[PDB]
Amino acid sequence: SGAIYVGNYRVVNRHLATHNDWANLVWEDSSRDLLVSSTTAQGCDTIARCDCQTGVYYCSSRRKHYPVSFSKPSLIFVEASEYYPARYQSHLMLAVGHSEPGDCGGILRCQHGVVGIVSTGGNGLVGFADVRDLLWLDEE
Numbered sequence: 001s002g003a004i005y006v007g008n009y010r011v012v013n014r015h016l017a018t019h020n021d022w023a024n025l026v027w028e029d030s031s032r033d034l035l036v037s038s039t040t041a042q043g044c045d046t047i048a049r050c051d052c053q054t055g056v057y058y059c060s061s062r063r064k065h066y067p068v069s070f071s072k073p074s075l076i077f078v079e080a081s082e083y084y085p086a087r088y089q090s091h092l093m094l095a096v097g098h099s100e101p102g103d104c105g106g107i108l109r110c111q112h113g114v115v116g117i118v119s120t121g122g123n124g125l126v127g128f129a130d131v132r133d134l135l136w137l138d139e140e
């Protein structure tokens, strides 16, 4: 589990979005595994605006933050997980590391701020849903 809290937005994995998220929906994209809802209180996070390929991510199933190198966001085939069938996921970055289903929502961060959240795992990789192209998160 986990979210990004930027401005008056809450960014979550689409598959973990709550009824309250859907009732306060700003934007959602199944192909990216992302959903954004509106918040009453302002959040503590800053979104990275950059093309970094190194950062640190939180792994809940290890209680640890790991430094990783990761691929630029692309269209990637993802094998079946407990929460999605085998399918293409867009705007996905991969790194070598540990990820189980419950690790979804852990932040990946670089020197510029939050890059994305954990969205995929298995076979020794961790996949992250990018948010650095969602420039509208920084206003309004």
Ligand SMILES: Cc1noc(C)c1C[C@@H](C)C(=O)N(C)C
Pocket (backbone or CB within 6 Å): 073, 074, 075, 090, 091, 092
């Ligand atoms: C799909 C997809 N996933 O992440 C990105 C980025 C895209 C959309 C578009 C920018 C694209 O296809 N590129 C450059 C790979």
Ligand SMILES: [Zn+2]
Pocket (backbone or CB within 6 Å): 048, 049, 050, 051, 052, 110, 111, 112, 113
């Ligand atoms: Zn960066």
